[model samples]
Every structure is written in structure tokens, then in C-alpha cells.
Target chain A: DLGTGLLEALLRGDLAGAEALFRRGLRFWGPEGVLEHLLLPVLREVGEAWHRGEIGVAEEHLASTFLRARLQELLDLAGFPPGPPVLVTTPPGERHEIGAMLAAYHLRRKGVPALYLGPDTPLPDLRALARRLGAGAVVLSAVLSEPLRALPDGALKDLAPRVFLGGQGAGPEEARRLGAEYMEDLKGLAEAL
Target chain B: DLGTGLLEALLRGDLAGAEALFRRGLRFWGPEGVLEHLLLPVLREVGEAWHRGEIGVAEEHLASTFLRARLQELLDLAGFPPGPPVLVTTPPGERHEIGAMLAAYHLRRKGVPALYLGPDTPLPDLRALARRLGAGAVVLSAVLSEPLRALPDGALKDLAPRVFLGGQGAGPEEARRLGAEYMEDLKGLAEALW
Candidate 1:
């Protein structure tokens, strides 16, 4: 019911109403309740609806814009320390980066600083920053398999001393092949980091 | 040449080009160069261009959007500690929150934790979070003069234990009237906070 109300409010472009519902969801769910209950479902529906041509472009854009704005706003309310960051980004061929943002948000909740580079970041640029920052790891997210198929063998080898790869695109097999580690889900991200 | 290049790149919606120039600016201006030289100058010109109708709405949106995404990326590389938070926000009227984001960026560089509430946050909501977070202070920015003049007498008196106020809209005089501290610039914010 909470998810249904938030999804409807988001499509109506009622960010205020959606926020009120998110505050309520907080009381019902735990801390990540905002992300788990409100943001994820709304975003999931938005993506599927857009994919199936059930939603118009304007509505899709509105839902995405408000969702991210609210997501980042909620991130601020989180009081995680900015330690040596674990850089969060995606491979060159994928731009579906909401997952990466969610990953970054999760890391922040656990007091692990995660810097999200959005998506389609070059390997060279990613590695350069990783070395400079002395990062905890490079958290890579890819939503599609085509992008994973495009990477050079052992493509992630030099990006970080430790690399975490996840999402629908690749798994433990691809992680091993690319010289990276696989995370089945973001729930266990803190411990892995 | 570089500022103009980044400014042009941004207006053209060439984020990769703008980012390249920002990286170059970082080399010349030291650490804060990203904000001071690149982000600030480009954002100023965008506002100026928009105000004069030299840029279209679409172009304006593109420039502002890229500017913030880049600004946040630069802030992340800063590696500031998330100590007990110091909430950053604006009064209920203003929404030009880029200034507040910049303030949060500076705090991060100094290893002070800043949780930016964007703009137009309610006073009661603002103060409530302040008490819960064990925050360093509530840093408020008002870019327009009208918003400050519209505030009730001592309106900011209860927002936080200490409030640092600044921007084009108000000054130390206004700060005292509202029982808030005035900061014209965010320089040395770490030193200013206990």
C-alpha cells in the first residue's frame, strides 16, 4: 500500500505528496526504508513502464528527475562520514546508472564513503582517480550484458587493488574473468568493502 | 582561454569537454581550483547569460545541470570526513541552492560533514533535524535580497544553536537582527566551527 501510494504520487509529479509518504514509510520500514520502500519501487515501475511504452517521455523524465532529486536529498539527511571513498561508477557501454546511485547511497548508510561517477566513465579515467584517491575499491555496475561483452579481457585489472562488479549484466564468472569480485546484491556491500 | 573553453563546452552540452577543462583548471588553481575557477565562473556566466536572454531555456538547463553533476563529482574526490553533520539549507522562499551545495563542498574538503537540505526547507523541520544530528551549525544562504527582507523579526532565532548567514541578500546587520552569525565567504569554515 505504501509503495502503491508513492508510485502514484510520483507519476502525478507530486514530489511533496511523495515525500510525505516517504516520511511515513520511514516509520514503517527501517532507516533504508526510504530507499527500499519508496524510491526503489517507484523507480522500478518507472523503468518498466518506460520500457513497455506505457508512459510518455515527459512523464518518464519527470518521474526520473523528481526521483533523483529526492534520492540525493535523502542522502544528505544520512550522516555518514566521508572516509577514503570507494569509487562507484559504471563501464563505458552502459548508461543505466540509477543502480550505481543506489549502490552509493547504500555505502553512505554504512559510513563507507562511495563516490558515484554516474555511468559510461572511461576505464582510464576511472583507474587514474582510483590510484590518486587510494580508494577502497572500484564498485562497477552494468545493467546490460552487451556492455560486459564489450570489455577487454581482464578489463578491470588495473582499476583498483580491489574491484567490485555487480548487476544484471555480469556475475561471478564475469567478475573472475575481468579480474574483479562479484557482489550478488548491494545488501552485503559494506562487509565486502 | 580555459574558462572560455569550459564555458563554451558547457553551453554546447559537451560535458566531456567541460570535464577535461575542469581537470586542467585543477592543475593550475590547486585543490579548490575546480570550484573557484571552473564551476563558479561558468555558473556565473550561465546566470548572466540567462538573465540577459542570451541563452535559451534548454541551453540554460543543460549548463546548470552539468555544472552541478560535475561539482558533486569534484566534491566526492575531496574525501572529507562525515563527522557529526552541519546542516546546510536556505529559508522557505529561495531555491537558488547552488551556493548551499558549494558550502557543503568546502566543508567536505576540510573534513567537516555537511548535509545539504537543498533550498526552501521549513524552519521547524530545519531546527528539528538540527537538534537530532548533534550538528556543528545550520548554515543558511539567501541569494536574493527580497527573501531576507521578508523574514519575520528574529525569525531565525530558534533554527540552531549557531547559524552562519551570508549571501547577496543580507549582511552582518541582518545577521544580528535575526540572531544568526554572518559569513560573507565560506573560507576557513573548519576553523570557524568548533
Candidate 2:
């Protein structure tokens, strides 16, 4: 029902118009509901728009950048439930960061605080920050399989009681191989934590 | 005709939608024309929206950040007309940087390449990079009157044949006081260069 307006507003780079639409979505669905039912749907349309040549590559980038910032604000305004911070970051040599960021943001909504240290964090250095926070969980994200394979002997094996390997690169087979929990997507993350 | 569509897209955080609108604008106005006629007008509306309480601070910031990146892309794709690059920076203790960046971006579009060194550039240190480039022009930008008053003797006075003081804080009176040229805005800038 609301897709056209939202798509048109996003296509124009109109933050306020989009805000109004998001508000409408929230009124019906709440933030959680908005995420699955509204945001993802529209973002899919955004991707398809690029594929369809309705928009160029630069346009696609700006939309996502804008959406990411606004999503952070949305989650922040929605607030968090008290819990220990889970450390989230991309492994060394993995520059794809948005998946890790999304994981962290979703974790906050799922009743845990997540520190997104961002791309290519060396494992040895990860211990320094993770240990100080007394964090018992770590989610290592990667877009390609090479970074997953790049993991040293015991990157998170010794550090956290709960360790997760996720993103397009990390799967159940690799997760089991590395002795870490496999998270296919943001779904069911709360129960796992 | 175009303002409605551009404003609508920006309000919703729609980059592709906005790019389409920008393309429509460019058909009538060149990159330079689109900047002045379309983008600035909408940004003014954005500022007004903030004042009118139509949007919150977070929304305002996202809009501007998105605009700045797209503007950088716009300028990059349009291409710079080559010349000796001018160095642009904010004086030490001044943190507001968009003014200096805009000056640099505009200067590039105007036929001379400009290097935006960004905020709080110390006078002594400016010499190192400026000397390497052999640049003959420097534009010092500030948002408040204090940073202008804070200048030490001869920050850019000895470095370039053309030194410009710009932004809200700088004035023709202060420009003369510092022996620098006062540039209130981008108009008549290319002629000022040669």
C-alpha cells in the first residue's frame, strides 16, 4: 500500500519525505515490524532499481549510506535493553563492513549491546578491547570466505564464552570447523545470545 | 517545477530518487547551474524545515552529510579545469569546515584546482604542504568572528600572490586589515584568480 510513496521519496533523496513514510510504517508496525516488513522490502526495490537501470551506481550508494545513518537513529530512538556488549567486527583483510554494522545494530534491538569495531580488526588486537569490556560474545563477519580462512588458531576460541561466525562468507560448515557458532542472518540472534 | 521532487527525496533519505532529480536539473543547467539553482535552494529549504520544526536535528544532519558526499561526487564527475592548485583551510581553533570545503569545491569548478586542507590548520605547518605544492593562492575560511581575530601576523601573507579571506566571519574591513582579499561569496572568483 505504502511502497510507491516511499520509493518515490527515496528516489528523490528526500529525507523528510522518507521520514514521514517511516513514521507511517512505525505507526502500524513498530520498529521491529518496520525493519522486516518495510525497510528490507524497500531496500530490495532499491537494489532492483539499480539492476533495472532506473538509477546509477552512485545513486545506489547514496541511498544505502543515507539509509544506514537513519537506521542507526531509528534503533537508538527505539532504545535498548540492558546487557553486556557483544563485540562485532570484520576479520583482517575483509573490508566489507555494513553486514557487521547491521549485525551490531540488530543485536542492540535484540537485548544486547554490540560494539561495532568495524572492518579488518586483527584478532590479537581484538582481545585487548573485548577483554576489557568483559564481553562474553563476539561476532566476526566477512563477505568473502578468505577472511574466514584467515582466522588464526584461536581468535575468539579463548576470549568469549559465546562466539559467532557470520555473513555471506561464514557458514555452518565453516563455523563448525572453527568451533564457533554459525549465524546465517540476524534472525534468531537473540535466542542464540 | 523540480524543487518538489528533490525535496521529497531528500526528506525520505532517497539518493537515487534525488540523483534522477539532479539529472533533470542538469539537462537545463550545467553542473554549475544545478549547484546554484537546484541544490542550494533545496538546502535552504532544509534549513528552513529545521527552523520550522518540520524535521529533527538528526534528520537535518543526515540530509547535509548525504548532500556533501553527492556534491563531492558531482564535482568529481564534472571534472576540474586544470591550473596551479590553491590551498584552502581553516585557521587554528576553528572547527567549522564545510565553508572551506565548499570554497575548495567551488574553486575547482571555477577553473582552478583547490586543495581543502580542512579545519584548524596551524600557520607554521601550512608552510610545509603549501611550499611543496608551490601554490600561489590560499583561502582562509571561518564561521565566527573570533577565528578571524585570532590570526597571527602573515599566515598566508608571505605565501601566495593571491590570499583570500572568506565566510561569514571575514569582512572587507578585516581583509584589508590583514592585507588579504575579502571574498564574500563565489561570484567573480575566476576573474579574481588571474
Candidate 3:
């Protein structure tokens, strides 16, 4: 019932309601409440509906945006780790920062000094910043599948610091092929760096 | 240029050739033929291809069946730990057994006695089997979404021994809702059972 309520609020294009209900429901749900109770299931349904053409692009975007913000809030509260500071960023043309941001948050929670460069970071600028900051490791986000085969390996290899590739983009095979360490998600990032 | 050969085979529906190329490529280009290097990449590619309809159902099935056999052969040689036996089965009406089998095989490699019960075992029968084996735990797999919600909690709760659920269906929240100890994956199973 609780899961259904949260799902309905978000699915019906009621972000405000969804957020409010989500918080209300999570009072007893604990740290994993949002993700477990609300986010994942709701996303599953919404994605299915979107796939079936029951929901339009606008609704999908609106729901995803709302959920992304909520997830970000949850991640911020999760915190980070203290270390040489790893910079996590989405590569050029990659707009999906949620996973990378979550990785950064989890890293921060583990006491690593982590910064999110957000989405669409140019290769030259990212490389320069990593050099200037002396970043411990740079985690690049690659959400799209095809872009992985086309990743600028030379530029990536040239980055001042070694970079870890992750997300849906860096398929395990591609990661191995590129000789780059890859993370499946936040937990993986936590384990890797 | 050599990579294009496998890609071309895939485009032409020459699944056997593609699979063979993948195997050969893994042996050559992969990490000295490590299972992780040789198999995981091909599986991931096949999964992606199936999702995109780039590969036909028959080809996908052939690839998966062959991979499953390959995985079984690998499992035989993994030299895993020898822990108490645990029966691993997917919940009733579920057909995706790859994840379950993978967990079973990996657990066995880690030296645990993991029995793959396959997919969709009836609750009563599964419990009976667990009792017959005096198993350490009954590990239930849930890969697909929503089908888990249909599971009879009364039956699950009444099982003979401790039960652990894993995979996507055991997503933290769902696991909590289902009232089963949830594990993340093979690694989690390895840690928990041991």
C-alpha cells in the first residue's frame, strides 16, 4: 500500500505530492527507505509505462527530475569520505549525473574527498582540472552504450590522473578492453575507490 | 579490424561463428583466459544485444544455453570451498535461472555446497527438499520485477529453515517487505553463508 501510494503520486505527475508522501512514508523506513520503498519500484513502473506509451516524454522527464532531486538529497545526507579527493564527473555529452553523484556521495560518506563535476564535462577541461587538483582518481560517467566503443581512449589515457569508467556505458568488456576499472553503481564505486 | 569479424557475424545471424569468435577472442585478447575475462564480456554483450533486438530469440537462446554449459564446465574446475549445503532456487513461476545458477556455481566455487534448484519450484516441494537435505539455508532468487509481489508470504515464512533472497527482486525495500534476509549477489552469498 505504501509503495503503491508513492508510485501513484510520482506516476500521476504529482511531484510535490510524491515527495511529501515519500517523506511521510519513510519516517519509519530508515536510510534505505526512499530507494527501497519509493524510488526503485516507482522508476520501474514509470519506465514500463513510458515504454508502453502510456506516459509522455514530459511526464517521464518531470518524474525523473523530481526523483533525481530526491535521490540527490538522500545522497547528500549519506555523506563522504576523507582522502586525496576523487573527482567524479559525467563525460562530455553525458547528462546522467545521478549515478556519478551518488558515487561521489557514497565516496564522501566513506570519508573520501569527492567532488561532482556534473554532466557534459569537456575532455580537455576535465583533464586540466584533474591535473591542477591532483585528484586521486577521476570517475567518468558513460550512460549510453554505443558511446563506450567510441570513447576517446587516447585522451582518457592522457588524463593527468588515472580515470575509472563506470555507469551503464562502461560495459564490463569495454572497461577491460580499455584497461580502465569500472563500477556498476554506487556500491561498486565504494568498493573500487 | 579483427573485432569487426565478431560484430559482422552477429549482424549476419551467424550465432555459432559469433560465439566461437567471442570465445577465441577472449582466449586471445582477454586476461589469459580468466573466466571473468572470457565469459562475462560475452554474456554482457549477448544480454545487450537481446535487449536491442540486434539478436533473434533463437540466437539468444542458443548463446545462453551454450554459455550455461560453459559456466557449468567452469564451475566444475573453480575449486570452491566445501561449506554446508544450501539449496538455491528461483521462486515459483519465474524462468530466469541464470542469476540463480550463477550464484550457485560461484558459491560452490567458494567451497560452499550450493544446490541449484532451478526456477519456479513449488513452495511446498522446495521446503520438502530443504528438509530432506538438512540445508543451511534456502536461497530464493528474484530477478524480474513485480512477480515477487505475487509470492505467498505465508508460504515463504513457513519454510523449514532460514531463507535468504537475493538479486534485483531482493532490492533492499522489497526484501524488507518480503521479510527475508536479503543478499546483494554472489559475493554477498559467499559472505553470508560462510
Candidate 4:
């Protein structure tokens, strides 16, 4: 019910109301529960509605704008940075960032310090940042097939030790070809790491 | 001549050639010249061509990708942070970031420490970041009219004391209504700050 109310608030562009609902959800269900049960469902519904043309681009952008800020706030408040460091980002040309953000949030909740480098991070920068941060693994999210196709050959193999690719666009065969492990969802990601 | 060559290289999808031309321009005229004379003009031409369907979206994206990387590399190398800090970004619903990036680059070349927050930065976060960074000003860019329209009434007034609106979308009337200064171009922005 709280999730439904939050979704309605967001759809109506009631940012204050949405924030209040989010606070209530955090109090009742805790960080992980609220994210998995409430936030993810709202995001999924928003994506579905946008695809169906039931909502316009402006509404979708508004939802993402508020949700990202709220998620960032929650992540900052979580403050659990003890385990191995992981770098999360999307390939060049992949613009969807909510999945990567959620992955980072989940990883942080699990005590791993995940540094999210947002969408369309250049390949060279990713490599340099991974080295600089001493990341044990690099995770890439792809919501469209075009970005996967945009990946240079041997790029994933070069990252070595551990590289994971997931999201709607990543196929098992493609992951195999790129020498990366395929993660189906947040649960799979958590288990893998 | 260098500008024409850079444009040709970009249109041909010759990343190496385009980068080499940019390097030459940098050596010849320095950061400000390359940005104003070579890169910005090329970007404008590319936009015009893209609008006329003379080029594809992939070509435009590729141009932006390489050009942004080069500009970032230059900014990192310049390391000039003497003036007051400025925060540059686009509001929610504005995904075009090259304009904001160019603004930050130009500000940095003029010896300002510009903290670029990139695209779709929420309004509240923008204010919070400005306060945290103790920024002297907040600069917003919008390539289309929709993002400007999306700005809530009094939002600009709320960010006052040193807020600027620019790019193709922000008109003088909009700036007046919002209680923000309107910057026409990079040269105008540099002059306003310096």
C-alpha cells in the first residue's frame, strides 16, 4: 500500500509527498526492503507506462530526477564501506543509470564499497578509475543491445580477474563471448560478489 | 582552415584525425582559441547538419563522445583554479550535456574553478551542492525549451545572488522572470565573471 501511494505521488509530481512516503517506507521496511519492494516496483511500472505511451517523457524524467536523489541520500546515510571495492558503470552509449545506481546501493548495503561512475563512462576512464580505486571487480549494466555492440573486442577480457555484465540487454552468450559473468538481477549480483 | 579540417574529420568519423587537428589548434592558439574558434563552431555546424538530416545520430554521438573526452583531458591538464567556484549543469529533462561541459571548460580556461554536475541534476541537489561547495554562482544550460518550461516558478529566485541562464533555450524574458542573469555566449560568460 505504501509503495502504491508513493507511486501515485510520484506520478502526480508531488515531490514533497513522495519524499514523505519514502521516509515512511524506510522507517517501516528498512533500506533494503524499501528499495527492493517499493522503489524498484515503482521504477518498473514507470518504465512500462512510458513504453505503452500512457505517460510522457517529462513525467518519466521527473520520476528519475527525484528517485535518484532519494537513492543517493539513502546510500550516503547507509555508510557501510568495509569490504572489497567494486566499480559500477555502463558502457559508452548506454544511458540508463537507475539499474547501475540500484546495483551500487545493494552492493553498499552488503558492505561492499561500490563506486558508481554513472552512464556512458568512457572505456579508458573506466580502466583508469578501476586501477586507481583498486577495484576487485568491474560491473557494467546495459539496457539496450546497441551499447553491447559498441563494446570493443577483447575489452572485457582485458579487464580480467572479474567482470560482470547484466540488465535487459545482456545475453548469456554475449557475456560468455566477452568473458564476463552474467548477472540476472540484484540477487544474482549480490550472490556473485 | 583548421576549423574546416576539424569539421571534415568529425563528419568523416575520423576520431584520430579530429583529435590531431584539435591538438594542433591547441598548440597554435591555446585552450580558449581551440574552444571558441575550433570546437564550438564545429559543434554548431554539426547541430545544424543534424537538424537538416545531413548526418545521422550515431555520427553526432560519436563526435560528442570524443570531443568531450578531449575537453575533459585538457581541463584536467590545465589545472587552473584561481577564481571563485562556479557550479554548471542542466536541469531535469535536459539530457544535452555538451553545452554545460563547454561552459565549464570555458570558465576553467578563464581561471575559475568550475564544478560541473552534468545533466539532469535535480534542482534541490543543485542548491545543496552550491552551498556545500560555496560556489560564487550557479550556471544552468538548456538546449531545448521544454527543460526551461519545466523550471518551477520562483526556482531561479530561490537560487539568487548569482544565478545565470544560457544556451539556446533560455530567453531574456525567462531570465528576467526568474530573477537570473542571461548569458548570451562563452565570451559573455567570461566577461561577466572576470
**Which predicted model would earn the best TM-score?**
1
Root-mean-square deviation per candidate: 19.5, 15.6, 19.5, 21.7
DockQ of each: 0.02, 0.02, 0.01, 0.01
DockQ category of candidate 1? incorrect
lDDT for each residue of candidate 4 in A98-120, tens digit (9 for 90 to 100):
77887888788667788887888
Better of 1 and 2 by TM-score: 1
Q: Per-residue CA lDDT of candidate 4, range B37-142, in tens?
A: 8778877877888999998888878877877876776666455586557888987899988888878878886788877887888888888877776778988888
- State how far residue B82 of model 3 sits from its true place (Å): 58
User: Which regions of candidate 2 are displaced past 4 Å?
Assistant: A1-193, B80-83, B93-96, B153-156
Write the residue-wise lDDT of candidate 2 on B6-87 in tens digits: 7788778776566667666865786678778887787778888999999898877776776676566564543556667788
Q: What is the lDDT of residue A168 in candidate 4?
A: 86
Query: Which window of ten consecutive residues has the lowest lDDT sum in model 4 chain B?
Result: B75-84
Lowest lDDT 10-residue stretch of candidate 2 chain A: A25-34
Estimate TM-scores for all models.
0.50, 0.46, 0.46, 0.47
Report residue A192 deviation for candidate 3 (angstroms): 2.5
Give lDDT tens digits, candidate 3, residues B1-194: 33456555756767646655655654465322534554556666777888998877877677677667656544544434555577888888778777787777777866787878778898889888887878787888887866678875555664645678887666776666666777875677778756
lDDT by residue for model 3 (A110-160), tens: 567778878778878988888888887888778786656766554466554
Local accuracy of candidate 2 as per-residue lDDT tens digits, A1-193: 6566777787788878877777666544445556666776777788888999888887767667766666677756644556567888888899867677778777876568787787788877886777887887888877899977766554557557788888878888777767788887686676688
lDDT preference between candidates 2 and 4, better one: 4
